[PDB]
Ligand binder design. Structure first.
Ligand SMILES: Cc1nnc(-c2ccccc2Nc2ncnc3[nH]ccc23)[nH]1
Lengths: 319, 10
């Protein structure tokens, strides 16, 4: 029967476009979770109750180690709430901020895990994530990746089936999307180039605060390759950021599999990635469940029919 | 220190 009275509210872990995320404790079980809390009002106001249903449904039907589990969805009169498994090692944005750059081996580990989950989404849920960014990437207690946020997913995409909605994050949009062409799943692979490029290089491949200029870069210019990149790495990023989806790594019929075979991932054993038998190159050092050292402090520190019923929103897990 | 980006949907 779940409501807000069933949890204690301990820490604000993050805030923004996505509503507010709070480290909560379930009263009846003592268990910790991240509760993402939206106001029903902003969601109608931005004509996007469809995103929330999409996210609800994508979370209920996914079980995968590198996607954050849902334990409850419940709504109130004024809010929608997604109680999800808590990722205790923090935001990867946090971590790459402190370190500037990841090692090849470390970027390889995370990227392996992202490919795993995205290959899952594509080939088992027929879902195209669409919004892969550093900011949507958490770490659990053992240092494994967790992808969160499914509002911008496309559902029911099979083979090369295509889509037209103009969405994502400006800095990550793939060329064929800027081009106002119909696009398919190879978007997700473009997004993965930008995240790998960020991890290994220390900056986005295309940057301007002016979008018109930012979009012209994405369309017009080749990536720069820092001289610290090994030849395998120059090759994976070059292939993942082919501007033509048809020429992109992961963009033929074999999808993720063209990326798993790439020499950058040589001697990564994919079933081992999946089964979590590879050592995370960084074990978060947390001192308890309530310890939020790896969450960013602007947040840790803080502490009608515009309000409709969302039908069959409410959910409680039981595999 | 890189600023956070923002997702959007037209
Ligand atoms: C989009 C989006 N959704 N959540 C965030 C976010 C941003 C900053 C810090 C923490 C976050 N979320 C989380 N932090 C720990 N554990 C978690 N499990 C599920 C989510 C989650 N961003």
């Amino acid at each position: 029967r779940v409501t807000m009275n069933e949890f204690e509210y301990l820490k604000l872990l993050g805030k923004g476009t996505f509503g507010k995320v709070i480290l909560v404790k379930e009263k009846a079980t003592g268990r910790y979770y991240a509760m993402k809390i939206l106001k029903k009002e902003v969601i109608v106001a931005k004509d996007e109750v469809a995103h929330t249903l999409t996210e609800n449904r994508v979370l209920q039907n996914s079980r995968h180690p590198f996607l954050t589990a849902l334990k409850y969805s419940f709504q109130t009169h004024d809010r929608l709430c997604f109680v999800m498994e808590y990722a205790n090692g923090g935001e990867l944005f946090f971590h790459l901020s402190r370190e500037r750059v990841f090692s090849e081996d470390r970027a390889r580990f995370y990227g392996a895990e992202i490919v795993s989950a995205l290959d899952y989404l594509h080939s088992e849920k027929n879902v195209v994530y669409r919004d892969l960014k550093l900011e949507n990437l958490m770490l659990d207690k053992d240092g494994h990746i967790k992808i969160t946020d499914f509002g911008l997913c496309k559902e029911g995409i099979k083979d090369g089936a295509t889509m037209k909605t103009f969405c994502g994050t400006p800095e990550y949009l793939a060329p064929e999307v800027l081009e106002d062409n119909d696009y398919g799943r190879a978007v997700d692979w473009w997004g993965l180039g930008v995240v790998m490029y960020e991890m290994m290089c220390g900056r986005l491949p295309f940057y301007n605060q002016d979008h018109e200029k930012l979009f012209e870069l994405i369309l017009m210019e080749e990536i720069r390759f820092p001289r610290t990149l090994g030849p395998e790495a120059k090759s994976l990023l070059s292939g993942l950021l082919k501007k033509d989806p048809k020429q992109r790594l992961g963009g033929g019929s074999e999808d993720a599999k063209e990326i798993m075979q790439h020499r950058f991932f040589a001697g990564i054993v994919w079933q081992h990635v999946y089964e979590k038998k590879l050592s995370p190159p960084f074990k978060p050092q947390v001192t308890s469940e309530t310890d939020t050292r790896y969450f960013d402090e602007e947040f840790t520190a803080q502490m009608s029919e515009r309000r409709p019923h969302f039908p069959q929103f409410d959910y409680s897990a039981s595999s | 220190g890189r600023p956070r980006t923002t997702s959007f949907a037209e």
